[PDB]
Amino acid sequence: TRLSLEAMLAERAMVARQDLAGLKRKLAGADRVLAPQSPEQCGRESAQAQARSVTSELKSAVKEAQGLEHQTLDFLEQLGEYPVCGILHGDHPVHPSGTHNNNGKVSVKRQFAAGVNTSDALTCAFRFEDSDLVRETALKTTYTDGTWAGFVQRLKMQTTRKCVQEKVSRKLLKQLFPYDPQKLVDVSGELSELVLGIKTNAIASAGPPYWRTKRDALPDMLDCVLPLLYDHIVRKDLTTLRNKHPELFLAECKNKTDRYEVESLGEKTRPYFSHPFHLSALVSVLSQSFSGALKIMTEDSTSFNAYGFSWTNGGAEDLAIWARQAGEAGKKPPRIACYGDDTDIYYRKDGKLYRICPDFKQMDGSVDATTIEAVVDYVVDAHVKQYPTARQFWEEVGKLWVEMATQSPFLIDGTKVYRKMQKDGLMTGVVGTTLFDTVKSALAYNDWADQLMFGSLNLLEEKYAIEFFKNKHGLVIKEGTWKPALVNEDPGFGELWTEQKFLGLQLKVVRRENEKVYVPNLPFEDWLTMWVTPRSKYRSKETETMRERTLFDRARGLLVTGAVFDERARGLMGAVINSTAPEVVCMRVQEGGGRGAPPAYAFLTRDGVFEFPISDGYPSYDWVVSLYSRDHPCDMPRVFPEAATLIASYRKQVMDTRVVIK
Amino acid sequence: PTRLSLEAMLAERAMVARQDLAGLKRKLAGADRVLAPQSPEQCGRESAQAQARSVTSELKSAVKEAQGLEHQTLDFLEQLGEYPVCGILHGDHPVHPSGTHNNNGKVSVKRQFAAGVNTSDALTCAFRFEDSDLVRETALKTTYTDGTWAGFVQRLKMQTTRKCVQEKVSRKLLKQLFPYDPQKLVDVSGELSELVLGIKTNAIASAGPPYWRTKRDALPDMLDCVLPLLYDHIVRKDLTTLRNKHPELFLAECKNKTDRYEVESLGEKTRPYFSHPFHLSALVSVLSQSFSGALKIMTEDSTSFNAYGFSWTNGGAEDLAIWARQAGEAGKKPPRIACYGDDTDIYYRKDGKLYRICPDFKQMDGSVDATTIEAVVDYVVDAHVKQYPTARQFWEEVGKLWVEMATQSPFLIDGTKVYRKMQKDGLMTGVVGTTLFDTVKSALAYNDWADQLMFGSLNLLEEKYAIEFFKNKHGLVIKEGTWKPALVNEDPGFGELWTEQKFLGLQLKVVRRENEKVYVPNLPFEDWLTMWVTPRSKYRSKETETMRERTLFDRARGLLVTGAVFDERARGLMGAVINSTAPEVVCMRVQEGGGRGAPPAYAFLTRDGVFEFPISDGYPSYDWVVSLYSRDHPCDMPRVFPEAATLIASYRKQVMDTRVVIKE
Ligand SMILES: Nc1ncnc2c1ncn2[C@@H]1O[C@H](COP(=O)(O)OP(=O)(O)OP(=O)(O)O)[C@@H](O)[C@H]1O
Ligand SMILES: [Mg+2]
C-alpha cells in the first residue's frame, strides 16, 4: 500500500480515465481540436423522431415479409433424427443438460426476429444531412435476420445447382496460387500446440455438440472431444464415432443476420453453416497456415490470388501497378484478381486499359466437388512436402475437410437432420470458404484468359461471357456486371481509377504535398448507407454512455476506410466525432486493446486487425493518407491535444534545487 | 475481443474463471489439497460465536466506559488564536474542500473516539480451535481501539512537557554512531519536481492541512499547485509572507493513534501523533529516505549503533547474533549496543558470560531534546550538501523547516483552536524522522553509558543505577523492571532460544534444516494469539462475507512467515485457519501487491520494506519459511492445490503427435 509519488500519479491517471463523472469536470473546460464538420439540418427532437419513423416502417416491412411461407425442403436428403450426445467432461456433458434438444434428439430454434438496428446511428444522420435524402438511403438497406421465404429459397440456390467439375492439375494450382513453402508451419509438430496457435472468433458458435460460445466451449473441445476425435483418426475408426456419437459430425445451416436490401428479402437471405468446434479447429490448422504462406497479385505476377490483399501501406497503389502491366487482349496475358467471389480483371483493347469488376450469383453454390477436393489436396500436399512425417495423418484430416465442405449432415429447424443430395455445391461457412470461392473463380478466369489467346475476343462481351462461364465452368455472372470501364491508369488529384468497386471500394488518387496517394473511396450514399445500417442489433441493456462511444468508434473506422476522401461523408462523421462528449473520447475503453474499436472492413491490413494508436485520437485527413502511403503513419492527432496533463491534473512545473536565495 | 488465438482464449478463461468463485467452487470443489498442521478444534459455529460476541461486547462496554471520562485541560499547550482557511484554489476547486472542516469562518477539526472496536471473526477462529477460557482472557487484556481522552491528553501532556537534557553531539561523533555510505545518497541536486516523485509514502494516509483528504486525493493539488507556491516562497527567503496569508499550510493535526492498547491503562494511555501537511511532509522526506537508505546498521559496520535498516530475513537473524557475540568484558573492551528508535538491544559480558539487556523507555518521544533534533537535521542535511553541495543553501532552508515540523509546528486537536508546544524539547511524534530522531537520542545516551563502563563504573549494569543515569543525564526514562541482563545461549540448540528477551517485538530462536541450524524469529503462543485476536482493522462496514475469509487467510499466512510456524502451538492455530478456509478463496484472484496475496503485518522482515509471497494460493510450509531466514534460496512456495492450474482452465495437455502412422 506504500507507493512512490510517481506511482500514485500513474495510479490516479489510469483510474481517473474510468471516472466519467469526474472526467467531464476536468475535460468539459478544455481546448478541443475539431474535425471538418457538416453543420447541424434540424433540431434534436426532429432528427431522434424521424429515425423512429424510418425504423418502424423498416420493421413493419420486415415483419410483413417475415409472414411469407417458406418453400418445402424436398431438395435435401434427410438422415432422419440425430440423437443427443453423449460425452461428458467431468462435471457436465458437452451438450448441456438443458440447452436445446427435443428429449432424445437434437434440435434448434430459428431466429427471424425483427428488427431494431439502433436508432442513434441513423439519428446522427438526420441531424446533419437532408431529411429527404437520409430517409431514402435509410429505406434502401436494412440489417436483419431475414425471412423464412428468402432463407430457404437462397438455400435451395446453393443446393440444387448444376456445377462443372473443373479440370485442375496440381501443377496448375502451383501456377495460379503460388506460395512460399517456408511460411507454412511445421505440421509435424504435436497436435495440441498446433491447434492452440489457431486464430478464430471467441464469441461465435462452437457448433455441435457444445451449443455454446467457442470460449465457453473451448475446454470441452480441447481436452475432451479433440483427443476422442484424434484417437479415432489414428486407426480410421471415425465410422465408429460417427455412429455412437453422430452429433460430433453434425452442422447447423443458419441465416446470416446481415445488411440486406429491403425489397429483396422475400427472396435473398444468405445461409451459412457452422461445423463442430473440434472439426472447425483441427481443419483450421492447414487453412490458416497455407493462407499465410499464400502470395498475392502484387508479389507474384503469375498469381490470380487476392486472398491476402490489403489497401494500406502502398497496397492500394500496388493494385494499380499490377493492373497496368496487363496486356492487349489476344496477344499478351491479362491481369486478373480473385478474392473469393469478388474479382478485378484488367485487359487492354487497342492499347487502352479496361477494367471489369463482375459478380457471380450465389457463387458458393457453383463450386464443384473436384475443385474442393483438389484444393484440399493441394493444401494438405503442400504441407506434407516440406513437413512430410505426418503424411498420412493430415490426409485423414484433409479427407474430413472435404466432407465438411460437401457432404456434412446439418440441422435447419427442429429435430430433422438434412444433407445436400449432391457432392457438388459448397457448404458456406465451412473452414476455407474463402479459398474455395477463390480457386473456383480463378480457374474460371484462367480458362477464360486462355480462351482469349485463341482469338476469341468475343468473350470480352457480357452476352457471350455469361454463356461461356455457365456451360463450361458452371459459374454464373450477374446480369449487368460485365461492363468494361476505361480506366485513367494515371489519374490526377481527386481523380478515380474507375467507377467500379473491388472489395466493395472504388480506388482514388489524392494529394500528399506534391506526391499523389492511391486511396479507397466511395460515393456518399455508400458511406451513408453503411453508417445508417450498423451490423449490431440493439443491446437494450447497453448504456447511454457506450453507444455515444460506439458511434465515435464507427465514425473513426469509416474515415480510415475512406470516408475522409469523400467530402459529404467526411463532414457527417466529423460532425459525429465533434458531437461526441469529452468524457466519451478519453475514457479508457475496452477493445483491442484499449485503443478504441477497430474498423469493421477487414482488408486494411494483412491481419484484418487494424488498430488505432490511441483511444482519444481522431483520424485527420493527412493522417489517413499517411496510412495508405508507403511511408510512416503520421501522428494520430488527439481530440484533446494535451489531455494527459489534465487527467493526471499535474502540469510539470520544473523547479531546480540550485537557486541562490535572497 | 473477437478474433484471437486459442492459445490466448485459454488465457482469457483462466484469468477470468479465477474471478468466478461460483465456478472455483465447482472446479476447486473436490480437488487435491495440501494440509497444514492443525490444532484439534474445540468449538465452532454458535458454540464459538457467542464466545466471541460476549468478548466483543465486554471489550467495548469497558472501552465505552473508559472512553467516558474527564480530560485534564490543555493548559500545558500554548494557544495561537485561530487559523484561517485556504484560500488557495486549483481550477474548479480549492485545496480545502467546501464541506469538510471547518465549522465556520476558520479551520476546525473533529477528533473522534468510536466504540468502536475490532471484528470478532478473527477472534471466532481462536475460540473455534484453541482453549476457550484462555482465549476468553487473552482477548480481554488487549484491544485495538481509538483510545480514551484522558489517555490521549495525559500522554500528550507527558511528551510535550518533559524536562529533557540537551546532548553533547559533535557532528563527527554522529559519523561514528551513525556511519552512512556517502555515495548511495540521492543526488539531491537534480531538480526538485522530479526528486519529490521518487518518495515512498502511504497512499491512503491523510495528507494533512489544508487538504483534509487521503494522499491519493490530494497528490495533484499539492505538486503543481502548493509545492511551487512553497518553493517560490522559499527561494526568495520570504517564507514569512506565506505565514500570514495561508497559515494552514504550516498547520499540523494532533490525532490519537488507533492501535493495540492494553485495557487497564486505557484511561491513562493513548498515543498522540501529528499529521503534517503533505507538501511539508513530502519535501522533507527527500532527505530522510535518501539517508535512511544510505545508512549503515549492526551487521555491516561494527562501530555503528544504528538498527534503522535491520531485517531478520536472509541471515539477518543470525547476522544479529554474530555481531552480538563479540561484545567485550564490561569495563575493559567495547560492548555491543543496538538502537532501533525506542527499541534497544544491549550486549555485554560479565566474567566471560554473555549478557543481554532489552529495556524500554517511557514516552521516549517526549524525552528527545532540541539540540539532538537540531544536530540530526544538520547531520542529514550536510551529508547531502557535501557529496552534492551544488544545492547547499536550498536544502539547508528545508532543514530549518524540518526542525520546525518536528518541534513547534502549530497543531489542532479538537474543535477550532490551534495549539502549539510550549517548549522546544520533546519530539513531535508522527513527523518524518521520528524513527531516526528516536534512534539518535537512544544511541547518544547509550554511547555515554558505554563510555562510563570504561571508568570502572560497572554499577550502571544494574537497573536501579541505570535508571538514574538515563533520567538525570539524558532525561531518558526507563520503564520499571525492564533492565534485566539475561545470560545468553551464545550457540543455541535446535529449538532453543537465544534469550527469552524481546528485540523488535520478536525473540531469537534456532531451528533445524537437514544438517545446519538456522536462526529465526519467534514468539510464545500468548503473543501470537494476541497478534491474531487483535487485528489492526475495525470492521469496515460494507466489506463482504467472502473478503474476510481471504483476510483471515492472508493474515494467518502472514504471521507464519513472521515466525508463527516456529512455535508449535501457534503453527497449529494458523494451519487450522488455512485448512478450514474455502478452496476457491485460496486460489481466487486476490487484490494485494501485486496479485500475490496480502503482505504480513511485520515491517522488518526485509527492509527494503516490502516482503510479498511468490503466489496467491501458496501455503507457508515450515520448510519454506526457514528458506527465507536462511542465507539460501527461497524455496518454491507450496501450493495448497497443486493441480489447480489445470483444474481452473479445465485443460490438461494431452500429447497427440502427428508423425504416427495410420493403420487399423
Ligand atoms: N510488530 C512490530 N512492528 C514494527 N515495530 C515493532 C513491532 N514490535 C516492536 N516494534 C518496535 O519495538 C518498539 C517497542 O516499544 P513499545 O512501543 O512497546 O514501547 P512503549 O512501552 O509502548 O512506549 P510508550 O511509553 O511510548 O508507550 C516499537 O517502538 C517498535 O519500533
Ligand atoms: Mg479531481
* CB of B276 shorter than 6 A to ligand 1: no
What is the structure's resolution, reported in angstroms to one decimal?
A: 3.5
Cα separation of A291 and A435, whole Å? 8
User: Locate cell 529465526: which residue?
Assistant: B520
- The C-alpha atoms of residue A212 and residue A193 are separated, in whole angstroms, by 23
Residues of A in contact with B654 (CB under 8 A): 192, 223, 226-227
Residues paired with residue B109 on neighbouring β-strands, in sequence order: B415
Burial A575-595 (b: 16+ CB within 10 A, else e): bbbbbbbbbbbbbebebbeee
Say how far apart CA A252 and CA A256 lie, in whole Å.
12
For the CA of B342, the closest atom of ligand 1 is 29
A244: which 3 cell numbers? 455412437
CA distances from A534 to A170, A555, A617 (A): 43, 11, 22
The sheet with strand A416-420 has its strands ordered as: A76-81, A416-420, A410-411, A251-255, A271-274
Q: To the nearest 10°, the Cα dihedral for B208, B211, B214, B215?
A: -80
> Last residue of a domain, which of A426, A459, A486?
A486
CA distance linking residue B275 with residue A454, whole number of Å: 96
Grid coordinates representing A499 are 467507377
How far does A197 lie from chain B, in Å, by closest CA? 6
CATH assignment at residue A174: 3.90.1730.10
- The verdict on A154 and A244 lying in the same domain is yes
Do residue A426 and residue A443 come from a single domain? no
Distance between CA atoms of residues A571 and A39, nearest Å: 8
Q: Does B395 touch chain A (CB under 8 A)?
A: yes
Rounded Cα distance between B262 and B585, Å, is 33
Contact (Cβ atoms closer than 8 angstroms) between residue A309 and residue A228: no
Could you list the residue range(s) of the whole structural domain that residue A541 is in? Answer: 12-41+522-647
d(CA A299, CA A315): 11
Closest CA to B567 of B638, B495, B499: B495
CB-CB neighbors (< 8 A) of A649 in chain B:
91, 220-221, 224
Ligand 1 binding pocket includes B505 (Cβ within 6 Å): yes
Cell of A48: 431522434
Q: If you take atom 13 of ligand 1, which residue's CA is the nearest one? A: B343
For A652, nearest residue in chain B (alpha carbons): B224
Number of independent structural domains in chain B: 1
For residue A12, the ligand closest to its alpha carbon is: 2
* Chain A residues in contact with B222 (beta carbon < 8 A): none
Q: Cα B636 to the chain's mean position, in Å?
A: 27
Q: Is residue A453 part of a domain?
A: yes
In sequence order, the 6+-apart residues with CB closer than 8 A to the CB of B247 are: B83, B84, B410
Q: Is B362 in the pocket of ligand 1 (CB under 6 A)?
A: yes
Residue A499 domain flag: no
**Cβ-based neighbours of B393, under 8 Å, separated by 6 or more:** A660, A661
Decide: residue B93, CB within 10 A, 0-12 exposed, 13-18 middle, 19+ buried.
exposed
Q: Does the residue A183 lie in any domain?
A: yes
- Write phi, then psi, for B71 (nearest 5 degrees): -135, 110
Dist. CA A139–CA A121, nearest whole Å: 14
Do B316 and B308 contact (CB within 8 A), yes or no?
A: no
Distance CA B147, CA B64 (A): 10
Q: Which residue has its alpha carbon closest to ligand 1 atom 3?
A: B602
Dihedral sign for Cα A493, A494, A497, A498, please. negative
* Residues in B touching A658 (Cβ below 8 Å): 189, 390-391, 394
- CB A162, CB A474: distance < 8 Å: yes
What would the grid cell of residue B391 be? 544545492
> Got the DSSP string for A103-160?
TTEE------------SHHHHHHHHHS-HHHHHHHTTTEEEE---HHHHHHHHHHHHH
- In A, residues 630-649, which contact B (CB 8 Å cutoff)? 648-649
Residues A418 and A448 in one domain: no
The one-letter code for the residue type at A414 is: G
- Going from the C-alpha of B334 to that of each of B302, B323, B328, B337, B455, the distances in angstroms are 11, 12, 6, 9, 12
Min distance A549 CA to chain B CA atoms (Å): 17
* Cell numbers at A144, concatenated: 436483419
C-alpha cell at B582: 474455502
Cα torsion B615, B620, B622, B626: sign: positive
What's the gap in Å between the CA of B395 and the closest CA on chain A? 8
Residues of A in contact with B394 (CB under 8 A): 657-659, 661
Range list of H helices, A165-263? 170-176, 191-196, 218-220, 226-233, 238-244
> Do A380 and A324 belong to one domain?
no
Contact B203 A648 (CB under 8 A): no
CA-angle at B275, arms to B292 and B189, nearest 5°? 40
Instruction: Sort strands A410-411 and A251-255 into parallel, antiparallel or unpaired.
Output: parallel
Q: Is the CB of residue A14 less than 8 Å away from at least one CB of chain B?
A: no
| Helix, strand, or coil (residue B464) | helix
Side chain identity at residue B224, one-letter code:
D
Task: Evaluate whether residue B489 is within a structural domain.
Answer: no
Cβ pair B13:A218 closer than 8 A: yes
Question: HSE on the CB side for B355, CA within 13 Å?
Answer: 18
Residue B204 Cα to ligand 2 midpoint, Å, equals 16
Does A568 share its domain with A594?
yes
Question: Which segments of B497-649 does DSSP mark as H helices, in order?
Answer: 525-533, 546-559, 568-580, 584-587, 622-629, 644-649
In degrees and rounded to multiples of 5, residue A52 shows phi and psi of: -95, -20
Phi, psi of B309 (to 5 degrees): 150, -15
Do A419 and A402 lie in a common domain?
Answer: yes
- Round to whole Å and give the CA distance between A485 and A493: 20
Q: Is B343 in the pocket of ligand 1 (CB under 6 A)?
A: yes
Residues in a beta bridge with A520: A507
With a CB cutoff of 8 Å and minimum separation 6, the contacts of B318 are B518, B519, B631
Residue A392 lies in a domain: yes
- Rounded Cα–Cα distance for residues B57 and B659 (Å): 72
**Cell 501456377 found at:** A175
Ligand 1: which of B438, B501, B504, B508 to mutate, judged by most atoms within 8 Å of the beta carbon?
Answer: B504
Report how far ligand 1's centroid is from the alpha carbon of A395 (Å): 76
* CB B552 within 8 Å of CB B121: yes
Identify whether B231 is part of a domain. Answer: yes
Whole-angstrom distance, CA of residue B424 vs CA of residue B368: 10
CB contact under 8 A, B656 and A226: yes
User: Measured between CB atoms, does B193 come within 8 Å of chain A?
Assistant: yes
Question: One-letter amino acid identity for B462?
Answer: E
Whether residue A115 lies inside any domain: the answer is no
Among A403, A435, A467, the domain boundary falls at A435
Q: Say which of A2, A191, A220 has its CB closest to residue B658.
A: A191
**CA separation for the pair B184, A451 (Å, rounded):** 84
Query: Which amino acid is located at A642 in the chain?
Result: E
Distance CA B430, CA B252 (A): 10
- CA A125, chain centre distance (Å): 25
Q: Spell out the SS3 assignment of A593-632.
A: CCCCCCCCCCCCCCCCCCCCCCCCECCCHHHHHHHHCCCC
CA distance B664 to B655: 20
Q: Scanning the structure block, which residue is given the C-alpha cell 476558520?
A: B106
With CA atoms as reference, the chain B residue closest to A224 would be B651
Please check whether residues A451 and A590 belong to one and the same domain: no
- Residues in chain B within 8 Å Cβ distance of A655: 191-193, 227-228, 231
By the CB < 8 Å criterion, does B195 face chain A?
A: yes
Nearest alpha carbon to residue B520 among B337, B325, B320, B305: B320
Q: Do A264 and A394 sit in the same domain of this protein? A: yes
Q: How many CB atoms lie within 10 A of CB B434?
A: 19
The dihedral sign for the CA sequence A549, A551, A557, A562 = negative
Method: X-ray
Window 561-620 of A, Cβ < 8 Å to B: 590-593, 608-609
Sole residue written with cell 480473385: A338
CB contact under 8 A, B658 and A215: no
Entry field: residues in chain A: 662
H runs (alpha helix) in B359-462 = 370-387, 392-407, 434-453
Q: How far apart are CA B451 and CA B444, in angstroms?
A: 11
Rounded to an integer, what is the distance from CA A25 to the centroid of its chain?
40
Q: Are residues A343 and A217 in the same domain?
A: no
Q: Residue B636 in contact with residue B614, Cβ under 8 Å? A: yes
B22 close contact with A: CB closer than 8 A: no
Note which residues in 365-384 of chain B have CB less than 8 A from chain A. Answer: none
Residue B269 counted as an annotated binding residue: yes
| Interaxial angle between packed helices A226-233 and A393-405, expressed in degrees from 0 to 180 and rounded to the nearest 10 | 110
Same domain, A167 and A274: yes
**Same domain flag for A465 and A320:** yes
Q: Which residues of B touch A591 (CB under 8 A)?
A: 1
CB spacing of B190 vs A657 below 8 angstroms: yes
Query: Which residues are CB-contacts of A182 (< 8 A; sequence separation ≥ 6)?
Result: A293, A386
Peptide bond connecting B116 to the previous residue in cis, omega within 30 degrees of 0: yes
Per the domain annotation, does B52 fall within a domain?
A: no
In 3-state terms chain B splits into helix, strand, coil percentages (rounded to 5) of 40, 10, 45
Asked if A288 and A360 sit in the same domain, the reply is no
Whether B496 has a binding-site annotation, put simply, is no
User: And the C-alpha cell for B640?
Assistant: 495448497
Segment (H or E) for B468:
helix B463-472
- Inform me whether the C-beta atom of residue B25 falls under 8 Å from chain A C-beta atoms: no
In the three-class reduction of DSSP (H, G, I as helix; E, B as strand; rest coil), residue A336 is classed as strand
Q: What is the spatial distance between Cα B377 and Cα B383, in angstroms, rounded to a whole number?
A: 10
Distance in Å, CA B47 to ligand 2 centroid: 50
C-alpha angle A359-A363-A368 in degrees, rounded to nearest 5: 140
